[PDB]
């Protein structure tokens, strides 16, 4: 039955996966994903099981790890968003000049975003900030700073706590059985209900990785819930890219009209994703 | 049991309603609707029961009656379309400048259309074309040109034939359980499936009025089917007004974007209406 030592084994294993990926990266796309997957697990573990670990160490590690996994996510997020949007436009045509223009506008904008993200990420990976946090992960592959009592402490109550945080958040979401035309400011909260759903997406991930830690170094219902929350997030962000593209100066009316449809489409996918999550969560 | 004489009684009664409305009109909005409702019934009757009536007379009456009921419908169609579209924009906001501008654009355009329709219709009603067809309706209030055999002929087989034409057309529609971005030419058939549904709307009306004729001078399922087909038609025409408004020169991108959403919304109502019809028709 799982203890501090199980927790240490899980942390050492993830740390080692991070160092493997890092070595592969320094011979690339595969390695970066492996770096994300492991960074995110370590960061989660340091949250859920913080009480069994040195507090300062946790607090120093977590934002740095978050900085790493976020920096490494950006290129891919822009790449998948473009694809999602081009697919949706093709579908919504059933390209007329409007759709074709919107497609080319987003291809230009998101490609720039991607290329910018790609170079920023490679810069980050050569930086002294990155090296320092990677060095700590190297230490963690050998030594885990467990608190004195940790080695004998039962991990299950901590995992349960994470499960509770998830289930209480879900209980607080509205049932299902739109704001499709809105403007755009940094003061606008155009889609306010997105935030609780995106928080649940994170809590669900915390719970998944806690189950992993407890098992140490397949629930299909949770995987289905988790897929639905990724579509929620992706559709949400895609809709926002369409809206924002519609504010680009000098675009033709037909282009903005297409982008209006595309924003609406992706907001319809947000709602479907919320329904899918609900069916999966309630079985 | 219904015969030629029942048919004559129904025609005389409708003709008389048309003359009443016409007299009221020449002391207005109420009277014009009554003129439509009766014209349409006479025109239907002359179609369904054409075999019991003088052919030339029928053929002379029908397009003239169609010209009357269509001319008199236009003002109202533009009025209801504006309302439907303003309601939908308010709903779809949940007004931002985009919505507000689209609203004002459509208000201007459809108001012009309405005022133009209103004056064209009053012109038509003062015309010698109108007077000639109204004069024939006056004759029909007294004498019906039944064929020799009509007085003894059973009306039910004719009514049944109309029912069959409806039920066969319905059988030929696709089951349910989009082309949201398209351009606009007089060669474009942007929403091709609309035509069979709109034909069914007319066949259903023919059937309703035949049931009336057979009864002589409440099925809720048929009324529900009929309501769903009116929404289909109204949503269809509303979507086309939004698309067309988006081609107005010099509109702002935000205005076109709103109109894109609104077209999509009304196309979603077309689909819902098709589903509603289907549930009502299959009970
Ligand atoms: Cl930062
Ligand atoms: Cl948005
Ligand atoms: Cl004509
Ligand atoms: Cl259209
Ligand atoms: Cu939005
Ligand atoms: Cu259309
Ligand atoms: Cu839509």
Q: What do these coordinates show?
A:
The structure is a homodimer. Chain A is mainly alpha-helical. Chain A has helices at about 5-25, 30-50, 55-95, 95-125, 130-140, 155-170, 195-215, 220-245, 255-280. The first copy, chain A, has one domain (about 1-283). Chain A starts with a helix and ends with a helix. The interface of A and B includes residues 98, 180, 183, 257 and 260 of A. The complex binds chloride ion (4 copies) and copper (II) ion (CU) (3 copies). One copper (II) ion sits at the interface of chains A and B. It is classed as unknown function. Keywords: Polyphosphate-binding protein, unknown function. It forms a dimeric assembly. PptA from Streptomyces chartreusis.
Strand content of chain A: under 5%
Largest beta-sheet details of chain A: none
Which oligomeric form is depicted?
homodimer
What's the alpha carbon Rg of chain A, rounded to whole Å?
A: 21 Å
Distance between the termini of chain A: 29 Å
What's the helix count of chain A? 9
What share of residues of chain A is helical? over 70%
Classify the secondary structure makeup of chain A into a structural class: mainly alpha
Largest interface: A-B, 31 and 31 residues
PDB class: unknown function
Keywords: Polyphosphate-binding protein, unknown function
Assembly: dimeric
Entry title: PptA from Streptomyces chartreusis
């Amino acid at each position: 039955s799982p203890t501090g030592d199980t927790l240490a084994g899980y942390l050492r294993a993830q740390a080692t996966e991070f160092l493997r990926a890092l070595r592969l990266h320094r011979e690339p796309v595969e390695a970066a994903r492996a770096l994300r997957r492991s960074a995110r697990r370590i960061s989660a573990t340091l949250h859920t099981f913080q009480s069994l670990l040195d507090t300062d160490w946790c607090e120093g590690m977590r934002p740095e790890l978050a900085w790493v996994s976020g920096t490494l996510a950006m290129e891919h997020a822009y790449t998948a968003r473009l694809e999602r949007l081009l697919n949706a436009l093709h579908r919504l045509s059933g390209l007329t000049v409007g759709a074709a223009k919107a497609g080319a506008l987003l291809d230009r904008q998101l490609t720039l975003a991607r290329t910018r993200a790609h170079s920023t990420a490679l810069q980050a990976m050569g930086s002294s900030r990155f090296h320092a946090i990677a060095d700590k992960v190297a230490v963690l592959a050998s030594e885990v700073p467990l608190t004195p009592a940790a080695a004998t402490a039962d991990l299950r109550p901590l995992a349960t706590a994470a499960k509770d945080r998830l289930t209480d958040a879900v209980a607080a979401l509205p049932l299902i059985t739109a704001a499709l035309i809105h403007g755009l400011s940094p003061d606008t909260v155009p889609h306010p209900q997105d935030a609780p759903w995106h928080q649940v997406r994170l809590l669900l991930r915390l719970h998944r990785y806690a189950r992993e830690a407890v098992s140490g170094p397949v629930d299909l219902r949770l995987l289905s819930a988790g897929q639905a929350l990724n579509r929620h997030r992706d559709a949400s962000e895609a809709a926002a890219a369409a809206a924002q593209a519609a504010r680009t100066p000098r675009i033709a009316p037909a282009t903005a009209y297409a982008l209006g449809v595309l924003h609406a489409d992706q907001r319809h996918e947000v709602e479907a994703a919320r329904f899918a999550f609900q069916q999966a969560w309630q079985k």
